């Protein structure tokens, strides 16, 4: 992170040891279940690119996942260099990625007016790679999720949304999936309740109708 | 949060990374079980509206829940604008919600004399939305909770109160529910013990009578 | 808590958000099992009455438990007013409870010479209420605890002491309970080993005799 | 702990609330399993005797364990007074134990040149008492540990070493126990593999030979 | 760690008590499962050799593991003394290991220009020893890992990679192992799917082909 | 509600009981909304739940007649 | 009896094109009679819509039961 | 208490034993309150628990006679 | 024998309106005799109230057992 | 797809249905890619998955004919 | 029928060395005929490669099925 | 110890073996205390454990004779 | 044989009041003979006390076995 | 290795296969050390593991002949 | 056949004290012949030591198999 020093000038604060341990727990124990993206996004709040690379040094070891992450970062760095050609110096994609930039360059950019938020930029490329990894480690297609013959509708909704949260689908597809597939893949008793609501039903109406089904 | 700087003037302290991770754990792993409201209320102590929005950026992803939260916030923001028409400037509902206000406006209001506690105000609108979400994700009506034929009365009381804590019921209804339904839905042996106490029984008397039932 | 400011004068430090979350976890998940009293006592180290009330705002919601806590606090506040009649001003019971006192009154009392430790006083009234609540939520009388026919003696000793720790019993009764009931309620094989030690046996002798029984 | 104040003079920092809660978790939930000694040793890093007594106020409640701890501390305090007769004043055993010494005496001793490290001294007496308690609560003699007929050798080695770590045995006895009993109490198939290594085998050789046995 | 003091000069900050407790949890509870190396690497960020030795004082007790660690450190210290003969003074291997160096020597080296990063050097020797220990405590050869007849391919990939992460294999061997053994040891149905991809398949292609197999 | 009981008869039983019930009007409001659906016959209950909680008694009867 | 509801509808509206009642009557005819002359199962399903149902609602609800 | 034993007889057994018991008056207080109910016959015990712990022995006998 | 307790009460008080003892006797009559002439099960339930029971307590306790 | 149905017939069924389906072109894109493989016959599905998602319909038919 | 695919290939190419069609024909002969004259199982496996398959792909795919 | 073996005979077996055992005197001290009780016959072992670890061999034999 | 140990003790001490040996003998008589003339089970239990046992220890140990 | 196969024959099978194997010399080193023991017959494998990984092929054969 | 290995050793060395070959031969005799004349099971166990085994290794390994 970045902290105002005793002289009032902004200075680096290293990402604290037990924060990195909380990220190591998230990488090692949750096996890229979709909550890894929220927890990465949270633990890296205000992280400089040096801090973000300090976190990715423990995605290393998951060498298949790390490869997908590195190539996604490189792909986005090239796309940055394409969208923003050459005119502190303005950061190139490798400067955003914290490989070629100095720490003082990173903090300078993040503390500029207007800010050049290279940390919270690079964090988007990393989150996009983590989305690819969460897809790879997903156990099921959304089309495989069906309600158990005695499964509570809440628990099926959780299985469904947890899977949907991993999918590649655009929001327009996720809307269609929510309405059609959540109804379609319910068990026949609960499906009968859901069908009676008609196509415009909110998830609130669906679940409140199916309490104790 | 808000912290007195080295100059003695009040300044922003960002909600720390591992605090946000503790909130991500509460959203992701506890599936809007009713303890999500206490834990939100605790983790957001002294949060500015910018901090609260930083926490809600991880209710996003639970898109059905996030919709209920956004529309509840907008509903309360309109109700604020109705209850407090136009006369720092006094905050409009979108200023309470931290969308249109600056961070310095938020801290200025929260540090005024008397304080204008826009953080601990907005936190009530958020908690009201989380109550709607906790209802939606509740597994059972309070009327579905019945003591198992060999369930310890303590464990049934916990199942009952945990469900009652999710319900929409006003306190007058919750009082009636406690006295009549907790007795009514006990198993017949324990119900016989509870009935013998009469209608005025405290929960202490009920549980102390039913130890080892 | 209370912290020496940059001017050297003592000032309030708010009980930190993730400390309150650790208390919410203790209230919500451990269901007033007896370790709730140690964890309350620990998390509230150096808490002012405003801090303690900030912690009790999450016992609220457990409305039966909260009622027992409020009436125990009020009972102790009246007993304080009785034991210390009217002569900073000396704190009345409601000043100890942090309802009628200002934060500066609370810190002034806690930092006086000699100290008037209104925080670590009020914390005793709260712990006394938590003892009543731990009794109510206890699953068994100490007289119901018997060693399983193949239960290791250590595990029965833990079940016994965990229950004994919840009981109302004075220390003289707890001594008698330890010696007579721990022997009496062992299974007949282990009971035979324990009886052979005679009445003066320490718990160390009992357990070291019963390793691998 | 001890911290350099803004004037550069050393001053007390109270053992933080959530550190005490992490110790309460270790005492309450791990039932004096042998890792309680490492976790006590870690959480009490740089603790003054006042801090250490603040931690032992939650071993209280485990009244049998607390008695063994108190009498071990008193025994060591007398042994200190014997080994160091009367000549800040030099600390007596009760000054090491933080009962008769002031906080400023404790910090003065710990910050002297050479240091008089009354905290990290007293912590040894406490750890010696915790060793007695870990023995009492041990479930088995080391002689009771035998490998299951299909138990992986790693898991038996863990059961064995975890038990050995609780035993009274001197290091010379622990060496003999490791070599003879770990071989002797293996199941006959794995025992056949281990015997083939001869008496000089390292634990590395034993385990690498028994992978997938 | 190392922190800039109020005078701007760099000074020691002790590795905080609850950080050491998080390491004790990692050593005691995770039984040298391979995530112990990431968690050591994370918790020891910026650790001086005195801090690292403070962490290794709780690998002590796992006396077989501690022996492998000590001899690996001594082996690397001798190799350091060989690779860097005698010319602050330049650190010898025992100065890197923090046995013969002073704390001020350690911080002086770590804060030099260019830095002499004795902490993040010594941490490599420790991690190399932890790799030996993780091998010893590994439950299986990579050749023993086979997919269950109904095991999801994701779960077999996790079992495989978790085992591969423990192995001695160089990266060239790990590449060959990934491609040939992951295919070879799949169950015959999933193996049929994997074989159809040909030898060049990425892990992404393998897993996306085997979703719901 | 009985296993074959017409919904108009069950409504009559319910409100006839509710007049004797001694709880306050606030509780009776919650009762009329929650219990009337909860204790309905499983077929009739399935019809009623599809109306949602805002339905009037007239609408509930109009839907459930002949179920 | 067991005629698919779309076929019963087609018969009904084909007849309603022929018989010559006034518009208010034809409205009432569709709304009451299309339900009341339906198969007993279909009639039971259709009454769950109440009196406001358009034909599209009736067909999408019934599905031939 | 026996499976058919009159409560007055069980009280006589209990207090006759309590006079021989060697524990202090503090323990005997706890005994008279806790054990007398705990070891009562399950029917009689069900009557006694409904009186609550503040009941006198006279009240306990007055309630349990003829159970 | 098995008469519902409300009916036994009604018979008793209907009789107590007729027989002419003084008020102190009538008080004692309700309190002792309404219990002691009850059905044996009802009598067993009613004695659990002790001597202080009003008729409302007696009826709400017994419920016809 | 049927247990013995030729893949060209299943493709005809699928796209004939897809023309009647009322969802937007964005959804239909996702449908044509995902559902066509997902609902294929297990043998034919095994052939299709080996082509990967980038395969054209012509390639899918060319592979699955005679499966 | 059940001849191992390598032996069928060897027979085919041994024959293709003898019969005298032009190069474009020989290319088409290997590509179409080596598949179309294969055993029915082998033919089924080989068509999964499409028309671009080299002989090395054909043999490493078929493995004699 | 055998299922019927007199404790004096088991002590003779044990110490006769202990003289042949090659471990150091520190280990033999731990052996004589721990193993002698641990490997005793379950009845005899129950007698021995009640003496506690500080008992002498003479006391152990004096207690276990005729068990 | 199966006589409760308290009764055997009472017989023994009643006899020891009568027979006229000197005090050192009477001490030895209680200590050795009260054990050695006991029932074989009682004797087995009592030897577990060793020679130092007072009569109160003997009775509280034996309990009539 | 076969259930009765002489170790010299299994070594010949293994290295004859290893010459055909297309992996690099780094992989073949790991193969010769790991697989030769791992795939040995359970009796022969038990002999081989007792030699440890540093043993030469000559030592492995010298130990396993006649197993 | 089934003779305990210590007894076979004792017979062998008792004989080796008598027969008069030179020292290099006696070394080879102990090393090869003590194994090769052993019982077939013992011989199988002993070859697992290789040629370097001293008699103490041979006895502590074999244990009479």
SS3 L23: coil
CB B181 within 8 A of CB B167: no
Tokens read off for M19: 């027979």
A18 touching chain B per CB within 8 A: yes
Collapse the DSSP code of B124 into the 3-class scheme (helix H, G, I; strand E, B; otherwise coil) and give the result.
Answer: helix
What is the tally of helices (H) and strands (E) in chain G? 5, 0
Cis ω for the linkage preceding O36 (within 30 of 0): no
At J61, list the tokens: 């038919």
Task: List the structure tokens of D195.
Answer: 């015997």
Token code pair at residue A77: 């760095």
Instruction: Please give the DSSP secondary-structure letter assigned to residue D97.
Output: T
CB nearest to B19's CB, from C6, C17, C64: C17
Instruction: List Cα–Cα distances, N55 to C133, N14, N46, N48, N63, in angstroms.
Output: 68, 17, 14, 9, 10
Residue E168: closest CA among N53, J49, D36? N53
**Contact status, residue A115 vs residue A109, Cβ threshold 8 Å:** yes
CB-based burial of residue G49 (10 Å sphere; 0-12 exposed, 13-18 middle, 19+ buried)? middle
Nearest-angstrom CA–CA distance, B95 and C200: 72
User: Are chains F and O in touch, 3+ Cβ pairs below 8 Å?
Assistant: no
* Closest to D61 (Cα-Cα) out of C72, C24, H34, C39: C39
Nearest to J47 by CA among K50, K52, E178, K65: K50
Question: Do the Cβ atoms of B67 and B47 come closer than 8 Å?
Answer: no
- In sequence order, the 6+-apart residues with CB closer than 8 A to the CB of J2 are J10, J41
Contact status of L39 with chain C (Cβ, < 8 Å): no
Secondary structure letter of residue A90 according to DSSP: P
User: Which of the residues J21, J22, J24, J27 would you substitute to probe the A interface, choosing the one with the greatest number of A C-beta atoms within 10 Å?
Assistant: J27
Per this entry, what is the length of chain B? 213
Query: Which one-letter DSSP state was computed for residue D14?
Result: P
Measured between alpha carbons, how far is M18 from M12 in angstroms, rounded to an integer? 10
User: Chain E closest CA to A133's CA: distance in Å?
Assistant: 9
Which residues, numbered 177 to 196 in chain E, qualify as contacts with chain N under a Cβ-Cβ cut-off of 8 Å? 180
Q: Tell me, yes or no, whether chains E and N touch by having 3 or more C-beta pairs under 8 A.
A: yes
A 10 A CB-CB count for G31 gives 16
Q: For chain H, what is the radius of gyration of the CA atoms? A: 12
Extents of the domains making up chain K:
1-65
Where on the phi/psi map is residue C131: left (φ > 0), alpha (ψ -120 to 50), or beta? Answer: alpha
H47 touching chain I per CB within 8 A: yes
Query: Alpha-carbon distance E21 to D35, whole Å?
Result: 11
DSSP assignments along O16-43, one per residue: HHHS---HHHHHHIIIIIHHHTS-HHHH
Q: Does the beta carbon of D155 lie under 8 angstroms from any beta carbon of chain C?
A: no
- What is the distance between the alpha carbons of residues D133 and D32, in angstroms, rounded to a whole number? 7
Which two structure tokens, joined as six digits, stand for N6?
């002489």
Chain F contact present for B169, CB below 8 A: yes
Burial of D144-156, coded b for 16+ CB within 10 Å and e otherwise, reads ebebeeebbbbeb
- Residue in A15, A21, A135 nearest the CB of E43: A21
CA distance K38 to B152: 73
Q: Which residues of I touch H44 (CB under 8 A)?
A: none
D41 CB near a chain E CB, below 8 Å?
yes
- Residue numbers after which chain M breaks, C to N beyond 2.5 angstroms: none
**Is E18 marked within a binding site?**
yes
For O50: left if phi > 0, alpha if psi spans -120 to 50, otherwise beta; the answer is left
- What is the dihedral sign for C-alpha A188, A193, A197, A201? negative
What DSSP character marks residue A179? I
Determine the Cα–Cα distance for residues A152 and A212; give it in Å rounded to an integer: 7
Q: How many CB atoms lie within 10 A of CB B57?
A: 14
DSSP-based three-state secondary structure for J30: helix
Topology at the third CATH level for domain D2-137 = Human Immunodeficiency Virus Type 1 Capsid Protein (1.10.375)
Q: Does E54 contact chain D (CB < 8 Å)?
A: yes
Tokens read off for M49: 């006390």
CB burial of J33-57 (b: ≥16 within 10 Å; e: otherwise) equals ebebbbebbeebbbbbbbbeeeeee
Q: Tell me which long-range contacts A201-207 makes (C-beta under 8 A, separation of at least 24).
A: A202/B64, A203/A157, A203/A178, A203/B64, A203/B136, A204/B64, A204/B68, A204/B132, A204/B136, A205/F52, A206/A153, A206/A157, A206/A182, A207/A153, A207/A154, A207/A157, A207/B136, A207/B137
d(CA C195, CA G31): 89
Burial of C93 (0-12, 13-18, 19+ CB in 10 A): buried
Q: What DSSP character marks residue N21?
A: -
Q: Is A131 helix (H, G, I), strand (E, B) or coil?
A: helix
- Which residues precede chain breaks (C–N over 2.5 Å) in chain I? none
Task: Please give the structure tokens belonging to residue I54.
Answer: 């009003």
Task: Determine the 3-state secondary structure of A165 from DSSP.
Answer: helix
Best to test chain H binding among C138, C141, C167, C172 (most H CBs inside 10 Å): C172
Closest CA to B133 of D31, A154, D15, D84: A154
Neighbours of B193 (CB within 10 A): 18
Q: Is M40 on the interface with L (CB under 8 A)?
A: no
C-alpha count within 13 angstroms, C-beta hemisphere, residue D84: 12
Give chain K's length.
65
Q: How were these coordinates obtained?
A: cryo-EM
What span, in angstroms and rounded, lies between the C-alpha atoms of A39 and A26?
7
Count the Cβ atoms, other than its own, within 10 Å of residue H3: 7
* DSSP code string of M14-54: HHHHHS---HHHHHHIIIIIHHHTS-HHHHHHHHTT-TT--
Burial class (CB in 10 A: 0-12, 13-18, 19+), M19: exposed
Q: Does E9 touch chain D (CB under 8 A)?
A: no
- Residue J65 phi/psi, 5-degree rounding, is -55, 130
Q: How far is CA A192 from the centre of its chain?
A: 35
SS3 D69: helix
Distance between CA E50 and CA E101 in Å, rounded? 9
Sort residue J56 into left (φ over 0), alpha (ψ -120 to 50) or beta. beta
- Which chains have 3+ CB pairs within 8 A of L? C, D, M
Longest dimension (CA), chain J: 33
Contact at CB, B144 and A174, closer than 8 angstroms: no
State yes or no: cis peptide before I11, omega within 30 of 0.
no
First to last CA, chain J: 13
- Is residue J42 within a helix (H) or strand (E), and if so which, with residue range? helix J42-51
Cα H46 from Cα B196, distance rounded (Å):
9
DSSP output for chain E: -EEE-TTSSEEE-PPPHHHHHHHHHHHHHSTT-TTHHHHHHHHTTT--HHHHHHHHTTTTTSHHHHHHHHHHHHHHHHHHHHHS----PPPPHHHHTTSSS-HHHHHHHHHSSS---HHHHHHHHHHHHHHHHHHHT--S-GGG----TT--HHHHHHHHHHHHHHS---HHHHHHIIIIIHHHTS-HHHHHHHHHT-TT--HHHHHHHHTT-
Distance CA B119, CA B1 (A): 9
Å between J33 CA and nearest CA of chain K? 20
The answer to whether N27 and N20 are in contact (CB under 8 A) is: no
């Amino acid at each position: 992170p970045i902290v105002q020093n005793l002289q009032g000038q902004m200075v680096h604060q290293a990402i604290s040891p037990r924060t990195l341990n909380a990220w190591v727990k998230v990488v090692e124990e949750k096996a890229f279940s979709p909550e890894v993206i929220p927890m990465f996004s949270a633990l890296s709040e205000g992280a400089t690119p040096q801090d973000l690379n300090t976190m990715l040094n423990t995605v290393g070891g998951h060498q298949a996942a790390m490869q997908m992450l590195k190539e996604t970062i490189n792909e986005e760095a090239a796309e940055w260099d394409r969208l923003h050609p050459v005119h502190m110096r303005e950061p190139r994609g490798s400067d955003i990625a914290g490989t070629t930039s100095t720490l003082q360059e990173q903090i300078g950019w993040m503390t500029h007016n207007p800010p050049i938020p290279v940390g919270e930029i690079y964090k988007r490329w990393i989150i996009l790679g983590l989305n690819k990894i969460v897809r790879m480690y997903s156990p099921t297609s959304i089309l495989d999720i069906r309600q158990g013959p005695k499964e509570p509708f809440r628990d099926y909704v959780d299985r469904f949304y947890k899977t949907l949260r991993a999918e590649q689908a655009s929001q327009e597809v996720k809307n269609w999936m929510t309405e059609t597939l959540l109804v379609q893949n319910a068990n026949p008793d609960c499906k009968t309740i859901l069908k009676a609501l008609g196509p415009g039903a909110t998830l609130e109406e669906m679940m409140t109708a199916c309490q104790g089904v």
